[PDB]
């Protein structure tokens, strides 16, 4: 019908503009994806009639590139949209059967390509885990209400015992980025690191609140729940130790609380 | 007055293998509440009983002292806290029999605990097992600097307590069982205070200085071990029919 052809025309215009901007955000230039392109993509995710699966597909397509720069930038763009985009974006990623498949990515173009490939593998793992974390609880741990009246401080015991290990698993994937400050020496890896830093602070806050809630419930828990809690507590200690190391790397390159 | 106290201390600490009798403990508690009772003389009577060579007399004098620290007027534990020395039983030995040998080990550990309980009280001028709890209580509202100084005091007291290190199959007479019941009541309450200190520290995570975070992390690491030990302590209690109803 005429109505259908007119509608198809608009959807074509829209799709092409998104794909083009994804390419712009993911050029071979060794710099983070440009703000103007990220802002444009964020706005796209907020348009009721933008096609989210097509947007995601464009980003996945860029991760099939052989250039570490294109691949890492597509991952950074995806992360940025998970954080700053409309919730429909992360929700779509959470609904998928598969996400990034980069565990064997390797760019052997040069020493920098080799070094960056390791970080691409670790970062891809983190974004997959971030999506699966969202799927399991239907919310983003880094965004929920905090404080005494917030989500993690008020959660019931049974749900809490299921939920803290999900936070722990996400935090592990995040910290396993395992970069040192002497390695944060190009705008691509630095852009990824800044997003990881913002996530880590917020994710740790949620983790910590979960632990506080569990400790408050100590005398009220069943014997077996106490055992699960103690295991959660013990694992939390090592993650707090690692978070302090992560914060030190950030401080060494001039990233601190002001950047949260 | 003094003679009546001394006599009752003796009755609380006879050679009979049974915990000190309630009627005598109640009498001593009332004594501590009499404005004109002499606390130092009461304490001295208890110390003198711990110079006895019988494990039964010595252990019962320690239990009587512990009972008064817990249930007596606060002037009693305050006086103990003010002393230059307390119990000196680290080499006590009633090598008169197997039971005497076995019990001597527990007397040494228990006396260490009571010394630590008094010194804990001295350092903060209150009893961790008695303070107001909950969101508006002492440990949940304490400021960061004081908290960092205070949790290690709790930890040190808890270590001396758990170091009693008894097994359920060693709890086989009314004397050691009376000491154990007091230790259990202290341990539950002391752990509640310890736990509240930890919660308060965790709440302050993002607000602490770098160095404070390091101190806090050490505190949290040590807390894990004590929680693990408390769990084992609670099982020993459960194995001899002591639980929450006995708190």
Numbering used by the authors:
A (entry chain A): 5 to 264
B (entry chain B): 18 to 264
Show sentences the authors wrote.
Here, we show that the R-SNAREs VAMP8, VAMP3, and VAMP2, which cycle between the plasma membrane and endosomes, bind directly to the ubiquitously expressed, PtdIns4,5P2-binding, endocytic clathrin adaptor CALM/PICALM. X-ray crystallography shows that the N-terminal halves of their SNARE motifs bind the CALMANTH domain as helices in a manner that mimics SNARE complex formation. In this study, we provide structural, biochemical and in vivo data to show that the internalization of VAMP8, and consequently that of the highly related small R-SNAREs, VAMP3 and VAMP2, is mediated by specific, direct interactions between the N-terminal halves of their SNARE motifs and the ANTH (AP180 N-terminal Homology) domain of the endocytic clathrin adaptor CALM. Thus, CALM:R-SNARE interactions ensure that R-SNAREs, required for the fusion of endocytic clathrin-coated vesicles with endosomes and also for subsequent postendosomal trafficking, are sorted into endocytic vesicles.
If this hydrophobic trough were indeed the VAMP binding site on CALMANTH, then deletion of helix 11 would be expected to increase VAMP8 binding. However, a truncated CALMANTH construct missing helix 11 and the preceding ten residues, termed CALMANTH(1-264), unexpectedly showed no binding to VAMP8 by GST pull-down experiments and ITC while still displaying normal binding to PtdIns4,5P2 containing liposomes by SPR (data not shown). Multiangle light scattering (MALS) indicated that in solution CALMANTH(1-264) is in fact a tight dimer. This was confirmed by the determination of the structure of CALMANTH(1-264) at 1.7Å resolution (final R/Rfree 0.170/0.191). The dimeric structure explained the lack of VAMP8 binding since the dimer interface (burying 2100Å2 of accessible surface area in total) was the proposed VAMP8 binding site. As there were no other significant changes between the surfaces of CALMANTH and CALMANTH(1-264), these data strongly indicated that the hydrophobic trough in which helix 11 (when formed) sits was indeed the VAMP8 binding site on CALMANTH.
